[PDB]
Structures are given as structure tokens and as C-alpha cells.
Amino acid sequence: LMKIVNNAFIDLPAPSNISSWWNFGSLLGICLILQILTGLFLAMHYTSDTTTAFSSVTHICRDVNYGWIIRYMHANGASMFFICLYMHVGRGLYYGSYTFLETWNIGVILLLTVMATAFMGYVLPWGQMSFWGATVITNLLSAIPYIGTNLVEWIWGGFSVDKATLTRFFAFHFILPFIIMAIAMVHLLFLHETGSNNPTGISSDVDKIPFHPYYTIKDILGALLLILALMLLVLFAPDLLGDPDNYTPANPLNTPPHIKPEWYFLFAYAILRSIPNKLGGVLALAFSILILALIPLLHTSKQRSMMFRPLSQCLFWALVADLLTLTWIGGQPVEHPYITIGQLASVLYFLLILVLMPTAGTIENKLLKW
Amino acid sequence: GAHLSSPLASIAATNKLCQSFQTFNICYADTGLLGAHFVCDHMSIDDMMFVLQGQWMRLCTSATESEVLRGKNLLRNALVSHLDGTTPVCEDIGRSLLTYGRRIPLAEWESRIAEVDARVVREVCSKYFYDQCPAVAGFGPIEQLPDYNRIRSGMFWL
Amino acid sequence: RQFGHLTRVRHVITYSLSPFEQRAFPHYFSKGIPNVLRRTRACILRVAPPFVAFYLVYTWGTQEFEKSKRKNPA
Amino acid sequence: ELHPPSYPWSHRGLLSSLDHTSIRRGFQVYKQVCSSCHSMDYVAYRHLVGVCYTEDEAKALAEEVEVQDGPNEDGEMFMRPGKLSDYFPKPYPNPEAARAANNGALPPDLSYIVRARHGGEDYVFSLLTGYCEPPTGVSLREGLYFNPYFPGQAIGMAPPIYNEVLEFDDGTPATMSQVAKDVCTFLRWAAEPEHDHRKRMGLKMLLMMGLLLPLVYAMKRHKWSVLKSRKLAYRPP
Amino acid sequence: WLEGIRKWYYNAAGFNKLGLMRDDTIHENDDVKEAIRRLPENLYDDRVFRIKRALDLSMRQQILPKEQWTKYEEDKSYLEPYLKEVIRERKEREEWAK
Amino acid sequence: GCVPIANYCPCHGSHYDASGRIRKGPAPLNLEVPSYEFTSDDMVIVG
Amino acid sequence: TLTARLYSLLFRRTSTFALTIVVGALFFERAFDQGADAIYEHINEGKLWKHIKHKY
């Protein structure tokens, strides 16, 4: 009788005014299992040695029976993964998930678990952006005084990246999804005491309904769109996001003229690149992420959602401009027309969050007298 | 209580799920209504239906001959004991003489029943219970009351 | 938590029908399309103008960058 | 930088494949021209099977070239005629020899160079066919040459290709252009031995997912139809 | 001038198009759960049917016709008396404990 | 943190000397001199 | 109709239900590959092996 715990996925109360957005809330369960499933079969032929790893990728894409697909179902799968999140998370702001303080913090620790995971996943094939993609980011932790040189050398397994740096990631990288796999259940546990959170933001206790016919197939419909949007890229444009350079062998004695990590850092990497100072931007980086833990002390409106806060929508979709800007501005080099942007866009990010969204509810309460 | 014959009834006495239920068979000209009426508390509705459908599908598929003889010998004592006096007799007459045409003698009601066996039931229940489009109602704390879709998905075994 | 002890309800009626007794997609074109537009007219004004500027800042971001690499008269 | 154009191809279409006849002449080029200084290490003759050559025919090329294999029972190594399992003959044993054979410059590998350079083919085809006289006010060391598509517009690329530099089997024209077509067709196959099959699943996917997606979208709308048509009321005293 | 804006902003929220009121859209904390629990049946039940139908329309993304919409002048403040009553007890509950 | 080229930070175009001292560029400092010692006129101990 | 007569025979009983699927799927497999490949040949005529599989 472990059949009573699996009612949360069968006979669970949940609302009925639910959009197609919340497909994304469960696709991660499909991305994660699929991605794990892919990568697991994928690591059947990976090798954790410098002299053969890049070749060991080529062992797949050429000589394995239909294994060449698996490099891309996994790799570009990781892009479709992140496409869910920043459609999964900005949701919680546009609807007000973040009041569930016990859950929202969990939603952070995943992100830093992943964004530090994925950083270890782009590096395995020794692409000439693997190396420098690991150098630059990891080099920053030298920014700290009196310990930065230690932990960095300590993680590099020496004084610079090498074979010893590789294997230490491959185990740290093959493992965390399982740590995520259990934290996923935790993320659903604190939910289970309270359930979901409609777009309106209203406690919809009166209109909670079953789950096996309705949202199951609805999620499957979303999974179809995911598999579609995943099968499309791998079949029609696998070179799109995965940068071309990463097919190059590794060589420390030469750099590309232009550096950029994978596209998804770029909203965050640009924030640091804006700051000419070294340390003065690093603390802004994690602060830009860890601000999410700091938002729920800024729920000024005694409403919840933003479907019923029109001014919030004016700001919220403006935030997306900044991220999608820093995304692009990050992936482009350091020159005068672009530095002028990030010096503003970085400030705009912190500004929209900590000044104007609070300012709204302080006003909107006054616009309607409470 | 527990010792009863209807497996539905025994469970209802076992765990005290419900307080009362009844069945029926209405007859109208080209149609009727087959179903049941049951009465329970708001923390027991789903299970009764799961058991209730659990009986219909059982008879659609797996109907023990001895259990048929139970009901064949229930129905005899029904119509007879129903006919205890004169007023019940004229209920049947004044009703049959607008529905069936003739009156049916009781020796004829018996001969029809004696033709019955489990082969018949598995055809009939398959025709009118199985996978059909039922009709539901509810007046009370029906907070546990599942949706018509789930109810229909519970209608066909497997 | 589950059904049964959530809250209170009084004097409420619910009517509903089987799926089989109704087409899946009735009035999809006939009634949906205005509702799409109505859904549109309530959201575009608070969604687009950010992306409008983005398209421009994406434009001027290239042109000024395009000119800077082109030489000066000297 | 310089952005190459989007030259069409026999395979640019999202259900277009490679002209294997074009590949067949393309492989001639790498052996006659590029295999003197380009080290394609991630390929073997066997992968050409089902693509441009056959088993026995391509094997005739493995018999052609000597390969260093086999510890002799004496404890030494030797040379043999290669086979289909053997990867291509590496020109030079190490990178440094290639730098020494050139004006300090290195030839890159050409296995995955297409997918490791923006534009891929269109870069390469216009690279060879972008040679011209240097402009006024430019100076270059010996060994270096001019080509606008290369970054810095300065390269130690000796001109490898020219009209009537060799001849091909069936006898098509050995122009600087047609040769430049087959070779870029050839290299795309290098970093994509799956093109013939990617589109096949490229097509099977659509006529399934395009066919399922309505049906699931109906089964959705099927179940939800109870609530897409649900009415209420409010009848207290 | 002000008062034209409260009427205006009240139309841009949209919840007057789903047959709802001002009070219905409030965020729920322990301070308000008491107040809701304190409400009378004649009015409390009238809360739910307002909410219950707006949900069913949010499912469809539909709304009500223009006649059924809510007017600003009828945006009754039925809940504020019960509410501020509570916080009058909250602040007494705390400062007295100080 | 990239590789300057000799006779020069390419990804930012930072003009250095043959000695490696910055003349022009975003590079704030002249480059890193490590500690070392010459055992002789033909050998080195870099560190 | 065809729809109704189909129902009583196959989609009624569950043990019969899965029988139709794998059977039809088997017969469906034989057709879908033949549909795609010929079209893939129809597009890229004069490019594939089987169109040069006679010269050698």
C-alpha cells in the first residue's frame, strides 16, 4: 500500500481556471527524466580523459547506431529545459506564486544547482569554449581577497585547468540531477500542504477538481509540443544554439576573438561584464539571482496576482525586455554602443524589482483604499 | 451486517460507509430508468461508487450461477408478497392494462424467469450498464463526488 | 489534504453534460476568433511597447556599432 | 569580419539531401590536394561505404597507402597497406612539423571545421574564391596572402586550388568552381554522416506529430468539454 | 483631478468584467481568514457564486456581457468593517504584549 | 583573461610592448611577471 | 454507420481493444516507411545510392 501517496498525481484537488502555462510546471519532470535518460545512455561512450574525450564524442556521432541523435536530444534538450524555467518562474511573478515562501526558496536552490550543473556540462567535450568557458567564470572566484586564489586552485586541481579539472566535474555533473530528482519531490511536498495557485491569485478552494483525465493529458499535450520543439531543432537546426566553436579541439595557447558562454548565462554574464571593477559586479551576479529569495518581502499589494494589477504588467513585461536585452547584449562584445546599455540595463534589472513593483501595491492599495 | 450476501451490503455494514441505499427499475413506454439511490456521508462517496461500479462490471462479465438463483428466488417472493390483498392486485391490473396490453399471469412470470441463466445476464448488463452514458444527481455535501468522466472511466472494467 | 473538509458551500447548482453528447470543437472559428481578439486587445498595450523599444534598441545597437568600425576622415 | 552570403545548395532545403555524385568527385580532391597538409583524423575509408564508394573500390585506396601498424615480434614497428578500419593517412606526425613545413602557421583539421566556423560551407566556398590582388596601402610578409573572408584578411594560405589543377574520374570540368562545390559538399558530410538519415526522421516526425497533435488536442477538448460547457446558478431563499 | 482615475483604473483591472468585486480579489492571510470566517451566511454565500463563475470563465478566457459587468458606484465596501476590526485586535494583541 | 598575441590582447586590442608593458587598451596593468631565478646564463627556474 | 459497427466489434471490450492496435500498427508500420522513403526518393531523385547502384 504505497498506492495512497500516488494520489497526489491522480486524485489531487487542483483548480479549474488553469491556463496552458502550467504545462511547463511538469515538463521539467519530462525534461529531467528524458535528459537523464539520454545522458545516461550517452555516457556509455564518454571518456573522462583529455587525450580522448573530444574524440570519444566523435566515437558517438559517427560510429554508433543512431547514437548521434543522443548528443542533441540531450544538449539542445538542455536549452528547451531552460526555456521552461524562465517561462515557469516569471509566471510566479505574473501570478504571485512567490507568496509560498517555503516553496519559492526551493525554486531557487534548483536554479543554482542547475546553472552550476550545466556549467559543468558544456565543458566535457573540450570545445575551445569549454576550456575558456570554464576559465573565465571560475577565474572570477579569485576576486575574493585571501581565499580566492585558494579555492580556485583547489578546484582546478593544480594551478590551471587540466585533466584533473575534467573528471572532477563529470562526477559532479552526472550526479546532481538525481539530487534534483529528490528535491523535485521536496518541491512538491511543501506544495502538497497548500496546493497550486491560480492566475487570479484567489484561494480557489471551492473549485478544486480531479487530475487524472484533465491535467494529465493536458501536460502530455505540452510534452508533445516539447518533443516537437525538441525534435525540430535536433533534426533541422542542431547547430543553432550550441556554438560552432565547441567542435574545435581544446588548446590553451589560442583563444577565439569573441568569447561567450552558452546563450542562457548571457542575461547574467552581461551584468558582470558591465562592471569595469572585478568584485563590484560579482556580488551583483548572485544577488541578481538570489534577489528571488528577497522578493517575497516585497509583496506590497494585498492582492496577489497581476491580471488584476494593470500597472504591474507595464513593469513586468518591461523586465523581460531587460533580460532578453542582456541576453543579446551579453553575447556581443565590449564596445561603446553596448557598454552604454549594460551600465543601464543592469541597473534597470535591480531597479524594476526593488523600487517599482513594490511602489505599485503601495499605490494600487491607495487607488482602491486599503 | 457482515454476514449478508450482497457484497456491497456487507462492506457497507463492515466499514459503515453509507447509511442506506436502494435500487429500482422504472418502466416507461419506449424507455425506463435503471440505477440506484444511495445515502452516505461526505467522506465516503467515492468508495461506494467504486464498489458499486465494481458490482455492475462483475455481472457484465463474471456472474456465478448460484448467485443468480439467489435473485431468481428473491423476485418470486417479491411479486407474490407484493400481491398480498386486493389493492396491490389492481395496481398491477390497472397498470399492465395500459403498458403490456394483457395481464400476465404469475405462472407466466415464472416461466420467463426459468429461462434465465448467467448467459443472459452477461448479455443484458453488457447492453445497458457497460460503457453507456449514465445520468447522475446529488443534493448535499458532495465535495467528494467525482466527475462524470471519472465515473464513466470507472464504468468499464479494464 | 483532499476533498471533503475544505470549506463551506450553500445554495449552488451545477449542470453539466457528457462529452459524448456534444461535439468537441463547436463554434471554434465562429466564436473563438473574436474572443482571441478580445483577449488580444486587453494585453497588447502592456506587452508590446517593451518589445517595440527592444526592436529599436536592437536596431540602433547595430547601426552605431556598424558605423564605429567604419573609418573616419583622417 | 565579413559575412558570406547564403549560397544555395542541393541540400539547403529542410528535406533536401546531398548529391552523392558530387561527393564522389569531392573525395578525389582531398587526396590529391588537401591531404598533403590537412590532418583529418576522425574519419576512415569505411564511412565512405553507402555514400560515394563501395567496399572493394574504397578498399583499393587502403591498399594504395602505407600505414604504420603492428609491433613486430622483434619488438619493432613497420608499415603495411591500410584497410577499411584504418583512418585517413595523417600528413604529418605532429602539429609542430606542420608549422615547420609552413611559414610558422598551422593547418587546422577539416573534420568538423564546417560546423566550427560561422556560415560553414558558404564561408569556405567563398574563401577559396575570394582571392584577389591586395588593395592599395597594404603590406604582407612572405608566405602570407590576402583573402577578405579570413579574419584579419591576412593568412599563410598558399593558393591550393586553380583551374585545371587536376582531373576527375567521369570527366566533368576541373574548374576552380565545380571543384569548390564538391569539396564543400564533402566537408559537410564530414561533420554530418547522418544527413541522409536526419531528414528521414526529419520527415517521419512531422506526419506523426502533425497527425497526433490534433488528436490529442481533441482528446483534451473531449474531456474538458464537460467544463467548456458547464452552467451554474444561485438559489437561496 | 482625481476621482475620474479611480473609476478608470477600476475598469482597467478587468475584474468588473468577471462579475467580481473589490474585496473578492484580496490576498489571504491569517488576519483575513478570521474576517471571512466572521461573515454572515446571506453575504458569505453571495461571495462564492461571484467567485465560482469568474473561475469558470477564466478557464474559457471568457467574460460576461456588458450589462452584467460591475459598476464602480456599486463596488460596495462590505468587508472593510469586519477587517479593520481584526487589526484593531491585532495591534492590541502585540503592543499589550510589549 | 585571454591570450595576447606577440607583436597584444586580440579580443580587446590592447597594445603591448615586446616587454609586455601596456601602451593602449582596456588592460589595466602591465602583464603578470612571475617570480623566477636563473641558475646560469642558459637555464631558468620559472617560479 | 461504419463508426457504430466498428464499436460493437472491437473498441467495446478491452481485451479486444489492444488487439486491434498492435495488429493495425503492424500493418501500419509496413506502409509508413514505404510512404516516406519513396517520397524521400521522389524529392532527391538522381542523388542517392540506389540511383547509382547500377553503374557499379
Ligand code: HEC
Ligand atoms: C599548401 C598546404 C595546404 C593546402 C594544399 C591546403 N591548405 Fe588549407 N591551410 C593550410 C595552412 C598552412 C593554413 C593556415 C591558415 C592560417 O594559419 O591562418 C590553412 C587553413 C585552412 C583552413 C582554415 C580556415 C579557417 O576558417 O580557419 C581551411 C578551412 C582550409 N585551409 C581548407 C583547405 C582547402 C579547402 C583546401 C583546398 C581548396 C586546402 N585547405 C588546401 C595549408 C594548406
Ligand code: HEM
Ligand atoms: C540539468 C542537467 C544537465 C545539464 C544542464 C547538462 C548540460 C550539458 C550540455 C549542455 C551538454 C552539451 C555538450 C555538447 O552538446 O557537446 C552536455 C554534455 C554531456 N552530458 Fe550533460 N547535462 C545535464 C545532465 C547530464 C546527465 C543527467 C548526464 C548523464 C546521465 C550527462 C552527461 C553528459 C555527457 C557525458 C556529456 C558529453 C556529451 C557532449 O559533450 O556532447 N549530463 N551536458
Ligand code: HEM
Ligand atoms: C526540476 C525542477 C522543477 C520541477 C520538477 C518542478 C516541479 C513543479 C511542478 C510539477 C509544479 C506544479 C505545476 C504548476 O504549479 O504549474 C511546480 C510549481 C511551482 N514551481 Fe516548480 N519545478 C521545478 C523548478 C522550479 C523552479 C526553478 C522554481 C523557481 C522559482 C519553481 C517554483 C515553483 C513554484 C513557486 C511553484 C508553485 C506553483 C503555484 O504557485 O501555482 N519550480 N513545480
